[PDB]
């Protein structure tokens, strides 16, 4: 399962951001198909619930090579829900920058295991249980607000 995680990180800037991929160290555009050659770490999409999206090929068959080969990409295409898959996705590109294609309210943010990694300036955020109705169906997930 975890073999579908893109691992192409490169700490050229000597910042040490790959540490957050392992442990919670003190940190202190339309959705299209992206190549796994640039992605570093898990790719999360928010439906609004947080979901990980693994590496696939150009057709959609699952690949388990950690995003090594140039053929491995990420299937990031969805309409706006309920009919669509997700509203957007976030991930870290291989040199340590956060990319987007989680913000419910300008004050809150959908919490997920790597929320502090993608958004470092969200540490001093209390947690709130949020019920959200997207087309009649409810979603009980945790959000990180002020």
């Amino acid at each position: 399962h975890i073999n579908r995680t893109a691992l192409n990180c490169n700490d050229s800037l000597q910042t040490g951001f790959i540490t957050s991929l392992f442990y919670a160290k003190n940190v202190d555009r339309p959705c299209d198909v992206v190549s796994a050659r640039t992605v570093c770490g898990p790719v999360y999409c928010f439906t609004p619930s947080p979901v990980v999206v693994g590496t696939t090929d150009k057709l959609g068959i699952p690949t388990y090579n950690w995003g090594e080969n140039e053929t491995d990409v990420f299937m990031l295409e969805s309409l706006r829900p309920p009919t669509g898959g997700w509203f957007g996705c976030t991930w870290m590109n291989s040199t340590g920058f956060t990319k987007t294609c989680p913000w419910i309210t300008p004050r809150c943010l959908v919490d997920y295991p790597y929320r502090l990694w993608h958004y470092p300036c969200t540490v001093n955020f209390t947690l709130h249980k949020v019920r959200m109705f997207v087309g009649g169906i409810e979603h009980r997930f945790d959000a990180a607000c002020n």
Partner: antibody, heavy 119, light 111 residues
Framework: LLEQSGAELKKPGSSVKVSCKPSDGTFRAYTLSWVRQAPGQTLEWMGRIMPTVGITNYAQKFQGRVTISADMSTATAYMELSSLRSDDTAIYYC??????????????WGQGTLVTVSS | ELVLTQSPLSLPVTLGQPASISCRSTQSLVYSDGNTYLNWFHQRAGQPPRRLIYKVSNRDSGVPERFSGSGSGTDFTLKISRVEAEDVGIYYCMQGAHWPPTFGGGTKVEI
């Protein structure tokens, strides 16, 4: 094109599992919806699953007693329908919707599986 | 509030006469990014349905040109020009611009 489980007779109260196997033997970028049709009734949409990511979206009518599972390496999606009753006797189809979402319909349809509930 | 109604429920047309099926809704199917998601289906006897139109005006592959779709918003129309003996069974209209995806009542076409 898509294979499907055979017909079954389940007594009221039990559960039923219906398999759906694409002809490729592998999963691809598409949503695999489940549609049923009661005798003399219009087509009813039950749930949606993306076998690549594992997202499930059930209808409010069947919420709480339906379970659409997936098993990769086997390329067979399942539909656990518990708490059966008389009106659940119908033909069940698995349909291939686009990966981007629904709306655009279903390209491929299963052969159909007639589940009969009777004592 | 959203209900799909097909009319007429039974459409008899002799072989070679143009036909039309109307499928009116109560809410606009324009959705967010446009592209009204209305789809027409055809279910034979003993066979599962099969899509012929996937976006009102767009025709699916493997479908004869004798099929066409029109309408916008609430009113919709599936019009057939040259009816053959092949076009038999029930015709459906599904919607995918409002959760959950629902199908039309059905229109049984006989010659």
């Amino acid at each position: 094109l898509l294979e499907q489980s055979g017909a079954e007779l389940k007594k009221p109260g039990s559960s039923v599992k219906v398999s759906c196997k694409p002809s490729d033997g592998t999963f691809r970028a598409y949503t695999l919806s489940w549609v049923r049709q009661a005798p003399g009734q219009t087509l009813e949409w039950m749930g949606r699953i993306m076998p690549t990511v594992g997202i499930t979206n059930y209808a409010q009518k069947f919420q709480g007693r339906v379970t659409i599972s997936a098993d990769m390496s086997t390329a067979t999606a399942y539909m656990e329908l518990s708490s059966l009753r008389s009106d659940d006797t119908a033909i069940y189809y698995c349909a291939k919707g686009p990966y981007v979402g629904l709306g655009e319909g279903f390209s491929e349809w299963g052969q159909g599986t007639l589940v009969t509930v009777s004592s | 509030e959203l209900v799909l109604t097909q009319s007429p429920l039974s459409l008899p047309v002799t072989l070679g006469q143009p036909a039309s099926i109307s499928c009116r809704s109560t809410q606009s199917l324009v959705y967010s990014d446009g592209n009204t998601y209305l789809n027409w289906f055809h279910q034979r006897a003993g066979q599962p349905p099969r899509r012929l139109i996937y976006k009102v005006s767009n025709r699916d592959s493997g479908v004869p040109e004798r099929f066409s779709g029109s309408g916008s918003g609430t009113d919709f129309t599936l019009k057939i020009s040259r009816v053959e003996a092949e076009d038999v069974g029930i015709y459906y209209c599904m919607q995918g611009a409002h959760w959950p995806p629902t199908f039309g009542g059905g229109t049984k076409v006989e010659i």
